[PDB]
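In the laboratory, one determines a bound structure by crystallizing the protein with its ligand and collecting diffraction data. In a computational setting the workflow is compressed into a single prediction: the sequence and the ligand go in, and a structural description comes out. We illustrate the idea with A1B14.
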Amino acid sequence: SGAIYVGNYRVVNRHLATHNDWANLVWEDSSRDLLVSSTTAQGCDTIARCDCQTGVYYCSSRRKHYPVSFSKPSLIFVEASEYYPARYQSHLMLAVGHSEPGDCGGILRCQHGVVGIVSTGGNGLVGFADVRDLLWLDE
Ligand SMILES: NC(=O)[C@H]1CCCN(C(=O)CN2CCOc3ccc(Cl)cc32)C1
Ligand SMILES: [Zn+2]
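The predicted complex, in structure-token form:
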């Protein structure tokens, strides 16, 4: 569990979206595991507009923040699950670090702000769904 709150938007993992998220839907992408829904309250999360590859992510399974080196956003194969079949997830960054199933939604941050949220993991790795290309979140 975890979300990004920027202005009049709420960015969540598409597989964890609730009924209100789909009733106030702005944009969703199964291949990115993202869903953005509208909000009545004014959010203040600063989105990073950068090309960073180092930052800090929040790990609910260890109740700790961790500094990571991560890859540039790309098409990475993800095994089938109870939310999606076997596909290539796009805009996904990988890093060496602890992650377990309840960790989806933990924020990844750099000096410039929010980079993305935990989406995949396993075998001593962590995957983040990037949000830095979505310039409409700010405008
Ligand atoms: N992006 C996706 O398709 C997600 C949707 C459901 C969750 N996904 C998983 O990988 C589930 N899982 C299995 C392997 O061990 C893990 C360790 C950490 C995390 Cl965050 C998830 C998992 C794929
Ligand atoms: Zn940055």
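Residues 3-44 form one domain. Keep in mind that any predicted model is a hypothesis to be tested, not a measurement.
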